[PDB]
Design a protein around this ligand. Sequence first.
Ligand SMILES: CNCc1ccc(N2CCC(CCC(=O)N3CCCC3)CC2)cc1
Ligand SMILES: CNCc1ccc(N2CCC(CCC(=O)N3CCCC3)CC2)cc1
Lengths: 193, 193
Amino acid sequence: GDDRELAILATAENLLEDRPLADISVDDLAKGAGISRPTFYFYFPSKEAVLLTLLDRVVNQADMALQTLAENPADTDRENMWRTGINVFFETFGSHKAVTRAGQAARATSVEVAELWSTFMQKWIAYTAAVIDAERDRGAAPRTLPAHELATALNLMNERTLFASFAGEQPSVPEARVLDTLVHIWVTSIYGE
Amino acid sequence: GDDRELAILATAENLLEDRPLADISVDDLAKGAGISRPTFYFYFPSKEAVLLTLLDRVVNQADMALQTLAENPADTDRENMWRTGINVFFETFGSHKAVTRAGQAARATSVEVAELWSTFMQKWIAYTAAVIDAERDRGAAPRTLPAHELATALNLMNERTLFASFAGEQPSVPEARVLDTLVHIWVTSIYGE
Ligand SMILES: CNCc1ccc(N2CCC(CCC(=O)N3CCCC3)CC2)cc1
Ligand SMILES: CNCc1ccc(N2CCC(CCC(=O)N3CCCC3)CC2)cc1
């Protein structure tokens, strides 16, 4: 039962590494999963719904890893605390580049993809703002910008910068320099006066 | 001659305010410009080429305004110098929201749109890095990150943040707060140690 669904998902992820969703057919997905085209339609109504499920898995993987980090006590080294959190996103999405690339392109055409991304960005921005607020409460960070607005711009920067680096876009920060670049901007803007 | 081309462009910009490019037909563009469908094809091969020309005009408008600012002497107030430059982009793209929205969505499907955006982002990032380098040379800014990498991430942040604010995306920084938010992040990351 679930083995066929997982085979369809694993096939779509493998094919997305070599070509976009528009160049992948239902025949290609069914062939790779070792099933017929009508058996595919039992599990998914379209190749677009396969992508949505793949993105949902990657997004929940990053969210669960962040929750594991958030539940444990806070790092006493301010810079390190932010670097470890940004690293969760760099590693999770960076381990699924083809899904990340396809998922971002789908946001323009799919209401479901746009809604899924929006829900998780709101969660991640709210947590970021809560940590900035805690840093301000303990006197470690100055009260400069509204914390939720600052958190919004820094999360949007990471989204655009990490995904440009993974895709090797021109322009982009080299993947081997992107974590240090983002951490510097987060620490200086959060603690800087 | 040029009046018909300008009428097609003005019609496309007006129609993009109410619906996406996919929902606008060549008949709609020809009707608004007061021409026939075959006369339209004399000026443009597709509605996609009309969008490309609109984006080219907005991008050159922002670049020319930045060049006017760059040619004049530098502002003695460090924060203000960066705010005036970011404001060129906020005002130029913010005065053409429908073209900005459509142009960004087209980057995923059009090689020509992606190439045009890439060329101008490289120019704007290189100028940004040159100003950071001048600030470091005069001892006003510390030598922290490689200037070109820092410039890349800050320009990508502005692209994503300004365009999310203009589109009223969830999440986004309110349009009335986006300039102060970006300037704070630019100044703290450029001058901060
Ligand atoms: C106090 N607890 C430790 C702790 C502190 C900070 C965090 N962070 C939350 C995540 C945040 C990064 C978000 C990001 O890079 N993206 C890319 C695409 C969309 C969001 C960076 C800091 C996590 C745990
Ligand atoms: C010393 N001369 C005065 C001077 C100093 C700085 C500037 N800047 C160049 C532009 C830069 C902003 C770029 C930006 O917001 N975007 C949005 C979409 C793509 C690029 C901000 C600072 C301009 C003139």
